[PDB]
Amino acid sequence: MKFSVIVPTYNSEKYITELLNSLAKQDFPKTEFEVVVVDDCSTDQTLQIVEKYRNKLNLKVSQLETNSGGPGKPRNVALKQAEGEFVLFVDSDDYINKETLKDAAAFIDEHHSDVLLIKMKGVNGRGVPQSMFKETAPEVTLLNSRIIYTLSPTKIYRTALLKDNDIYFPEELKSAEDQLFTMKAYLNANRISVLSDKAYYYATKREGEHMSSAYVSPEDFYEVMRLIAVEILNADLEEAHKDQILAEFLNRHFSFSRTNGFSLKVKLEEQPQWINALGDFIQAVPERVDALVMSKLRPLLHYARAKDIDNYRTVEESYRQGQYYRFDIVDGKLNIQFNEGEPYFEGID
Ligand SMILES: CC(=O)N[C@H]1[C@@H](OP(=O)(O)OP(=O)(O)OC[C@H]2O[C@@H](n3ccc(=O)[nH]c3=O)[C@H](O)[C@@H]2O)O[C@H](CO)[C@@H](O)[C@@H]1O
Numbered sequence: 001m002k003f004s005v006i007v008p009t010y011n012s013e014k015y016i017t018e019l020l021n022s023l024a025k026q027d028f029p030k031t032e033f034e035v036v037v038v039d040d041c042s043t044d045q046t047l048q049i050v051e052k053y054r055n056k057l058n059l060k061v062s063q064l065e066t067n068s069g070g071p072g073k074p075r076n077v078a079l080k081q082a083e084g085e086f087v088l089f090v091d092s093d094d095y096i097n098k099e100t101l102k103d104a105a106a107f108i109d110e111h112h113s114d115v116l117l118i119k120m121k122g123v124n125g126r127g128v129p130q131s132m133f134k135e136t137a138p139e140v141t142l143l144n145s146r147i148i149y150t151l152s153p154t155k156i157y158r159t160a161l162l163k164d165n166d167i168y169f170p171e172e173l174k175s176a177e178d179q180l181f182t183m184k185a186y187l188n189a190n191r192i193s194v195l196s197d198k199a200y201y202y203a204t205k206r207e208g209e210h211m212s213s214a215y216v217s218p219e220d221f222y223e224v225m226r227l228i229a230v231e232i233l234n235a236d237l238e239e240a241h242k243d244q245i246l247a248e249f250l251n252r253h254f255s256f257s258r259t260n261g262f263s264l265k266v267k268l269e270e271q272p273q274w275i276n277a278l279g280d281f282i283q284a285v286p287e288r289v290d291a292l293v294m295s296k297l298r299p300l301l302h303y304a305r306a307k308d309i310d311n312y313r314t315v316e317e318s319y320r321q322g323q324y325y326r327f328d329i330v331d332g333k334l335n336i337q338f339n340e341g342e343p344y345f346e347g348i349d
Pocket residue numbers: 007008009010011012039040067068069070071072074090091092093152153154174175176177178203209210211212213
């Protein structure tokens with residue numbers, strides 16, 4: 001069997017039909033893929049809707065006896081049941097192009113990808129990464145492409161890549177669980193490819209809670225970030241490349257995650273919890289890596305590593321206001337001292 005399409009469900013009755021219709025409309029043999037649905041203890045009619053496709057799809061259904069607290073555990077249960085040569089993770093409120101499995105099977109057959117990124121499209125307002133999907137590419141790397149800016153699991157992965165290297169989702173975690181999973185898959189794959197010939201993965205914005213907006217404590221969130229830093233630094237790769245991958249991950253994280261601006265947005269009285277958790281993550285990053293990140297991040301790494309919220313916050317407010325304690329302009333960039341007696345940080349733009 002070529003593919004296992006893995007679908008975690010949770011009270012998905014209002015939309016799960018759109019996904020299952022897109023799976024049944026695949027212009028790809030139904031004998032060559034299976035749909036592995038693991039229901040995270042829904043209380044609605046999700047499962048009765050899924051069972052209407054039993055004779056239409058190669059279908060595997062099971063249900064956890066209690067809600068696991070996120071997508072991770074149902075996808076892990078499904079991954080173990082999966083028999084396809086490759087897996088594709090699709091969320092219950094999304095759907096896929098009818099040529100997706102055909103196009104991906106044809107592309108994998110020629111290029112032997114271990115991880116295949118497939119171009120996504122936002123539906124009614126949903127934002128989706130696009131910077132890595134401007135071109136189809138048989139071979140890309142963590143350092144010569146923007147794949148690190150997309151860590152969602154809505155990609156195709158060789159099943160043996162995941163299982164031979166023991167790559168699973170963290171469980172009982174509302175969100176960011178995918179970042180470690182996909183970074184592990186990136187770090188272990190012999191070849192990563194990008195298929196951009198059409199819109200393959202449609203990501204919707206329905207309502208009710210979306211996981212990636214549910215509460216996760218700073219402690220749980222930044223533990224996944226620390227594990228990622230540990231994972232990179234332990235990969236079987238040359239030392240300089242590992243540092244460079246960690247730096248790129250840090251550029252992404254400080255630009256796009258909840259870390260960005262947290263000292264401006266989080267209630268003052270909650271910020272010591274944030275800097276203690278963020279600092280535990282930055283303390284796993286060797287200081288030599290700071291020289292490789294975007295220069296504007298170097299003071300944030302500095303004060304995070306010292307768990308110094310007052311100076312971290314001064315940096316963020318200085319950026320936001322454009323008011324600095326002292327600074328020089330050298331080569332069109334800023335050399336900034338953010339507070340009396342503190343270091344100057346150079347090259348900021
Ligand atoms: C970036 C992207 O394109 N999609 C990700 C985004 O989607 P998103 O924020 O939309 O998260 P969702 O609410 O759709 O949950 C994702 C999937 O997990 C299932 N679910 C949800 C709650 C639960 O307790 N048990 C359960 O199985 C949903 O039915 C759904 O199939 O944030 C999630 C949390 O990191 C990721 O896993 C999604 O893949």
